[PDB]
Amino acid sequence: RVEYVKKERAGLRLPLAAWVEKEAYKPGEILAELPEPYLFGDKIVAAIDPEEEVIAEAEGVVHLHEPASILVVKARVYPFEDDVEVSTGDRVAPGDVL
Amino acid sequence: KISTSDPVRQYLHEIGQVPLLTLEEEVELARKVEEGMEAIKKLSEITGLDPDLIREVVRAKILGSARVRHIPGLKETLDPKTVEEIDQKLKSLPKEHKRYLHIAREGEAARQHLIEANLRLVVSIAKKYTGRGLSFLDLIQEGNQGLIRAVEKFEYKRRFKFSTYATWWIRQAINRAIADQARTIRIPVHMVETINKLSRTARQLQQELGREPTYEEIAEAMGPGWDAKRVEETLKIAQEPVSLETPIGDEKDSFYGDFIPDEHLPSPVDAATQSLLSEELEKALSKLSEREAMVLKLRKGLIDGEEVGAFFGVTRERIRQIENKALRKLKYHESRTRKLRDFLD
């Protein structure tokens, strides 16, 4: 599990910057965000944002360091339902009994 | 072994392993704590459960099992069944409200985390309010309580960081503690500052006279309503008590409390008094008319110290009548057979 990211290139990261560049959270424009080769999940511009902020007006910010904290734990993405014992873990996406 | 070092090492070690970054970590945790609040409230909104209950159930699941609920708070929340029911409804909260549940817990977590990290802050502060009359550990502890207090009110929206905020909320907690627990006989915070002012003033007055100020100077230098009676009083309250058990006389084997006599206890002389007094008082009380003798015997000797309100139905004129005529016949025959004359007191 990594944490914050600056502005070398933004790709595959969480919902944080989504609202920043309104193209993807306002409308479906994250695909066109890839600039010029699209004519010839997250993928942002070539490298336009450099802060851990909220972009109404660049006000709620925090320019700093990016952690890489390795958690030694097992990560399950799509657990399924087996009712022998009480439903353990999770369902695909809807139900979360955990 | 010895207690200061162990705790110092204890939290200094954990800060050493986790100090909070200036901005990021404190911001992070802060944001999470607040969201917790907004979460818990929205939870109360949708559950109809008091935010106090929603707060205690997320606490149990993140801070401790049935063990922490049963011993600390005696027993109103069923150790298992109760808290669990509460967690079930939280689960039932669809995608929308379930979100707040998950946030609340993570928030609560952050909370404790921000609290751990800024413990060096307390100790650094608490370090200076040392020789006030409280143990360093006691001092750090109250200050700790103070930092927890801060956590509840910090608004991260207002850019200033927790450092400067904790300082105040801690310094307040400490000073209070110093004023409330430091002495054997409680003294309100006002009397405290008063005594500090009194002390400080005596200092500036020691400065030039070469004469430990008579309580004249102190009154003057202090201000508006200060007089000799006031300062002599304050410094009389300022002297802490003494030890009923202190090494006395030549320090060999002398314990201070054998010297103090006793007052309520009837020294033999008194027990003998009450015996004759009551037997003789009881002999007279019977040979009389009960009407106004018992009235005044009971009104005076049975409940509390009202001529009119002393006699039942018969008005004042029969009261004074028999009171003063029986009281004198009683006194004058007691003058004959002198038994009472020798003032039992």
The two tokens of residue B90 are 């939280």
Mutation to test the B interface, candidates A51, A52, A54, A59, most B Cβ within 10 Å? A52
- Give CA–CA dist B339/B322, Å, rounded: 23
Please give, rounded to a whole number of angstroms, the shortest distance from the CA of B8 to a CA of chain A. Answer: 27
- Give CA–CA dist B220/B267, Å, rounded: 49
B96: left (phi over 0), alpha (psi -120 to 50) or beta: alpha
Chain A residues whose CB is inside 8 A of the B158 CB are: none
- Give CA–CA dist B304/B50, Å, rounded: 52
Which residues fall within 8 angstroms of residue B231, CB to CB, at 6 or more apart?
B198, B215, B218, B219, B222
Which residues fall within 8 angstroms of residue A57, CB to CB, at 6 or more apart?
none
- How far, CA to CA in Å, does B277 sit from each of B149, B266, B296? 64, 14, 17
Closest CA to B207 of B221, B194, B196: B221
Q: Is B187 exposed, middle or buried (0-12, 13-18, 19+ CB in 10 A)?
A: middle
Task: Yes or no: say if B68 and B56 are a contact pair by the CB < 8 Å rule.
Answer: no
Amino acid at B164: T
Please say whether the dihedral angle defined by the alpha carbons of residues B100, B105, B111 and B114, taken in this order, is positive or negative: negative
Phi, psi of A43 (to 5 degrees): -145, 115
Please say whether the dihedral angle defined by the alpha carbons of residues B324, B329, B330 and B332, taken in this order, is positive or negative: positive
- Give CA–CA dist B117/B67, Å, rounded: 26
Task: Yes or no: say if B32 and A72 are a contact pair by the CB < 8 Å rule.
Answer: no
Please give, rounded to a whole number of angstroms, the shortest distance from the CA of A38 to a CA of chain B. Answer: 35
Q: Tell me, yes or no, if the two domains B1-183 and B266-342 fold the same way.
A: no
Q: Which CATH code fits B187-240?
A: 1.10.10.10
Q: Does the beta carbon of A96 lie under 8 angstroms from any beta carbon of chain B?
A: yes
The number of beta carbons lying within 10 Å of the beta carbon of residue A68 is 8
Nearest CA in chain B to A64: B24
- Reported for B96-99, long-range contacts at CB under 8 A and 24+ positions apart, including other chains, are B97/B42, B97/B43, B97/B46, B98/A96
Q: What angle separates helix B5-17 from helix B95-117, to the nearest 10 degrees?
A: 130
The number of beta carbons lying within 10 Å of the beta carbon of residue B62 is 15
Q: Does the beta carbon of A65 lie under 8 angstroms from any beta carbon of chain B?
A: yes
Chain A residues whose CB is inside 8 A of the B27 CB are: 62
Gaps in chain A with C–N over 2.5 Å, residue before each: 40
Chain B residues whose CB is inside 8 A of the A52 CB are: 24
- Give CA–CA dist B89/B47, Å, rounded: 8
- Give CA–CA dist B295/B320, Å, rounded: 11
Closest CA to A51 of A42, A40, A60: A60
Residue whose entry in the numeric block shows the structure tokens 């413990």: B119
Nearest CA in chain A to B95: A94
CB proximity under 8 Å: B 72-111 to A: 91, 98
Query: Structural domain boundaries of chain B?
Result: 1-183, 187-240, 266-342
Amino acid at B167: T
Task: Yes or no: say if B56 and A91 are a contact pair by the CB < 8 Å rule.
Answer: no
SS3 letters for B51-112?
HHHHHHHHHHHHHCCHHHHHCCCCCCCCCCHHHHHHHHHHHHCCHHHHHHHHHHHHHHHHHH
The response to whether B342 counts as a known ligand-binding position is: yes
- Give CA–CA dist A24/A45, Å, rounded: 11
Please say whether the dihedral angle defined by the alpha carbons of residues A68, A74, A80 and A83, taken in this order, is positive or negative: negative
Q: H or E segment at B207?
A: none
The two tokens of residue B18 are 């986790």
Fold of B266-342: Arc Repressor Mutant, subunit A (1.10.10)
The two tokens of residue B190 are 């006002």
Q: Is B81 exposed, middle or buried (0-12, 13-18, 19+ CB in 10 A)?
A: exposed
- Give CA–CA dist B342/B345, Å, rounded: 8
Phi, psi of B229 (to 5 degrees): -60, -35
Chain A residues whose CB is inside 8 A of the B155 CB are: none
The response to whether B339 counts as a known ligand-binding position is: yes
Radius of gyration of chain A (CA): 18
Method: X-ray
Mutation to test the B interface, candidates A62, A87, A90, most B Cβ within 10 Å? A62
Please give, rounded to a whole number of angstroms, the shortest distance from the CA of A52 to a CA of chain B. Answer: 9
Exposure string for B227-256, b = 16+ CB within 10 A, e = fewer: eeebbeebeeebeeeeeeeeeeeeeeeeee
Chain A residues whose CB is inside 8 A of the B98 CB are: 96
The answer to whether the Cβ–Cβ distance between A64 and B98 falls below 8 Å is no
DSSP secondary structure, B231-266, as one string: HHHHHHHHS----SS-B-SSSSS-BGGGSS--SSS-
The answer to whether the Cβ–Cβ distance between B23 and A96 falls below 8 Å is no
Residue whose entry in the numeric block shows the structure tokens 């230098």: B221
Q: H or E segment at A55?
A: strand A54-55
- Give CA–CA dist B13/B37, Å, rounded: 30
Q: Within a 13 Å sphere around the CA of B144, how many CA atoms are in the beta-carbon half?
A: 14
- Maximum Cα interatomic distance, chain A, rounded to a whole number of Å: 54
Closest CA to B293 of B329, B332, B322: B322
- Give CA–CA dist B82/B234, Å, rounded: 54
Q: H or E segment at B319?
A: helix B316-336
The response to whether B226 counts as a known ligand-binding position is: yes
- Give CA–CA dist B64/B79, Å, rounded: 11
Q: Which CATH code fits B1-183?
A: 1.20.120.1810
